[PDB]
């Protein structure tokens, strides 16, 4: 990792992150065979089997009722991202719901537990059968429940049953609680055997396959499930796994803290509002403004392209000489000098103005330094902690190359506009000069 302190604006840009960006969805359609359960009835009295059976049949009968429905940039982007995801998933479920497609899916899963299927709407879904409960119900439990008597002396039957239905009951809980669209792929929607098997079937390059098989917790975390329905005594649902059609491109993260100067004792503060993740995608700079969008694993940042807003390629001029590019770098400005620490990956920005006493120290030595007034950049090599008054921040002990891009801060070199002095999320030349 690399990190430039941009002295001109009290903001770091951290570079050398690689990219993984979701660009499509892969559909795995699971036929969980609940089995013959609605032909078994305990009728003798209270019993272990009756209780598990009633739960299983009650859950199944419940599930039949469950169904799905068949500028401040952050709020915009994360609005679109979720709307796009559900619409992409629902559009496929709405093909699979057709009885011609379910019966095709079910039929190709007759003698194999895994099938590749092409829907009439052309999507080449994978299909999977889960039968562990059906096999138990058909071979064991149907033979045990003689003539509706079921308080049998075999407790191994009843304890066994409470294991096999456990997955089914968990699937019902998750779809019913979420009204048919789960936010993430639980171990009960897709076990880790099936995720690895589904990943290995994706129509993707082996680089993505290896990367996905390593980061499979992220693949699980980005995907989501939709309930198709209950058909016969199979619940049918589907899991939209991500396809990471962009990888290995540059990304960087911009952090900022308030830059201020006491012009005649009045703090002309400025803060960059264009903070957050940026990536190059296919020859376009893409900005991911919402904090849910992107997550790191080492150098890899896992973003969603549906959350990205394209920004002009000139926008990196805001990281080189924001003072003097004509691109409209977004800032806030105003009178009040907030003093704060912004923890970057390889260090901390420390905004420290009149009032608070800021210091940096190491566990070996205590206070190493009292920081000057004004924004300072503390590499994670300079100290182990920063303090702001009595508040102590532990710094991220991480190897990387820090840099300083020197320059007199804008706040200290341009004059603030007399009125309005406080302006939120404006192009910089509206605050200064």
């Amino acid at each position, epitope marked *: 990792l690399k990190e430039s302190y941009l002295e001109e604006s009290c903001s770091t840009i951290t570079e050398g992150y690689l990219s993984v960006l979701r660009t499509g969805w892969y559909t795995n359609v699971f036929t969980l065979e609940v089995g013959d359960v*609605e*032909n*078994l*009835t*305990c*009728a*003798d*009295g209270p019993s272990l089997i009756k209780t598990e059976l*009633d739960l299983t*049949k*009650s859950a199944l*009968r419940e599930l039949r009722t469950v169904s799905a429905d068949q500028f401040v940039l952050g709020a915009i982007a994360c609005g679109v991202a979720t709307a796009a995801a559900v619409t992409a998933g629902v559009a496929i479920a709405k093909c699979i719901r057709l009885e011609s497609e379910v019966t095709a899916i079910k039929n190709c899963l007759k003698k194999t537990n895994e099938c590749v299927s092409t829907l009439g709407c052309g999507v080449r879904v994978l299909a999977t059968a889960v039968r562990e409960l059906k096999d138990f119900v058909s071979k064991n439990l149907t033979r045990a429940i003689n*003539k*509706n008597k079921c308080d049998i002396p075999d407790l191994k039957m009843a304890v066994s049953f409470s294991q096999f239905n456990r997955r089914f009951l968990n699937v019902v809980r998750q779809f019913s609680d979420n009204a048919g669209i789960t936010p993430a792929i639980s171990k009960d929607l897709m076990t880790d055997a099936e995720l690895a098997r589904a990943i290995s079937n994706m129509p993707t390059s082996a680089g993505q396959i290896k990367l996905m098989l390593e980061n499979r917790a992220m693949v699980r975390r980005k995907g989501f499930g939709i309930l198709i329905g209950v058909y016969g005594s199979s619940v049918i649902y589907m899991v939209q796994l991500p396809i990471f059609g962009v990888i290995d491109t540059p990304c960087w993260i911009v952090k900022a803290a308030p830059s201020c100067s006491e012009k005649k004792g009045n703090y002309a503060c400025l803060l960059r509002e264009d903070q957050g993740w940026y990536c190059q995608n296919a020859g376009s700079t893409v900005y991911y403004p919402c904090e849910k969008d992107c997550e790191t694993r080492g150098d890899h940042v896992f973003c969603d392209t549906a959350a990205g807003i394209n920004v002009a390629e000139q926008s990196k001029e805001c990281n080189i000489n924001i003072s003097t590019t004509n691109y409209p770098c977004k800032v806030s400005c105003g009178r009040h000098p907030i003093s704060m620490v912004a923890l970057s990956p390889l260090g901390a920005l420390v905004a420290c103005y009149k009032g608070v006493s800021c210091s940096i120290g190491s566990n070996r030595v205590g206070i190493i330094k009292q920081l000057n007034k004004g924004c300072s950049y503390i590499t994670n090599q300079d100290a182990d902690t920063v303090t702001i008054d009595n508040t102590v921040y532990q710094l991220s002990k991480v190897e990387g190359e820090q840099h300083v891009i020197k320059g007199r801060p804008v706040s200290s070199s341009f004059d603030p506009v007399k009125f309005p002095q406080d302006q939120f999320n404006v192009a910089l030349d509206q605050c200064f000069e």
Partner: antibody
Framework: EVQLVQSGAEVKKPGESLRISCKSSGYTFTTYWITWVRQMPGKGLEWMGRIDPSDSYTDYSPSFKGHVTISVDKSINTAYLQWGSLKSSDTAIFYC?????????????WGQGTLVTVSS | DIQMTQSPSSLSASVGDRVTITCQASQGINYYLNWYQQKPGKAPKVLIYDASDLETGVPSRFSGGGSGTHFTFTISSLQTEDIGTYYCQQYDNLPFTFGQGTRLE
């Protein structure tokens, strides 16, 4: 069409023997349980018991266990209900009814009821 | 035994009326409740099974619902042939007690 025609209407002195009959037809007789249901005149229905003709296993209501018996002539698709001693209280209409499933225990096809009357 | 209280013991209604009948077990019977119509001088006829499901060829004006202990049955618009006595029946455990039977006239 599944149809369960019954014996008819029968008159007895108390303590006489009697058997009702139900010639089921239109389905494979062994695969469904035959229930017997009693209705005292204008009163509620009372489930008396059932037989599985596949093996003549029987359940009874505790009220009737050991008073009535349920049987089948599997050879002629015919169930029976039989009393040792008819009490004069035991005058009612009796319907045999096919139990619709081994899991979903409703009674789907009902015989035309047999009147039994028992007095002296 | 599950006792099957059923109310009201009788009804009267116009054609078109959304009459409703209730059955209430003495225990939990899950959803194992059936409803029968008996026309006068006829053997009973099943209308609903499993608390909620229309038997085949039953007119879709009939309906029911509920679970656990309280169940209801509704004729969403009564018709002149629907005059008769209605019985609930649990099958959650042996013996399969019928309800008291509610006469609709």
């Amino acid at each position: 069409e599944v149809q369960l025609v019954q014996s008819g209407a029968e008159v007895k002195k108390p303590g006489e023997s009697l058997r009702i009959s139900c010639k089921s037809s239109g389905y494979t007789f062994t695969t469904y349980w035959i229930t017997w249901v009693r209705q005292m005149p204008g009163k509620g229905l009372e489930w008396m018991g059932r037989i599985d003709p596949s093996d003549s296993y029987t359940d009874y209501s505790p009220s009737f266990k050991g008073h009535v018996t349920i049987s089948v002539d599997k050879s002629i698709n015919t169930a029976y209900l039989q009393w040792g001693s008819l009490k004069s209280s035991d005058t009612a209409i009796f319907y045999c009814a096919r139990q619709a499933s081994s899991g979903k225990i409703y009674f789907d096809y009902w015989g035309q009821g047999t009147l039994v009357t028992v007095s002296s | 035994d599950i006792q099957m209280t059923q109310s009201p013991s009788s009804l009267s209604a116009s054609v078109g009326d959304r009459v409703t009948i209730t059955c209430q077990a003495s225990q939990g019977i899950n959803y194992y409740l059936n409803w029968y119509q008996q026309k006068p001088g006829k053997a009973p006829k099943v209308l609903i099974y499993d608390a909620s499901d229309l038997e085949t060829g039953v007119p879709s004006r009939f309906s029911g619902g509920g679970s656990g202990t309280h169940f209801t049955f509704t004729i969403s618009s009564l018709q002149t042939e629907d005059i008769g006595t209605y019985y609930c029946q649990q099958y959650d455990n042996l013996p399969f007690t019928f309800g008291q039977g509610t006469r609709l006239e």
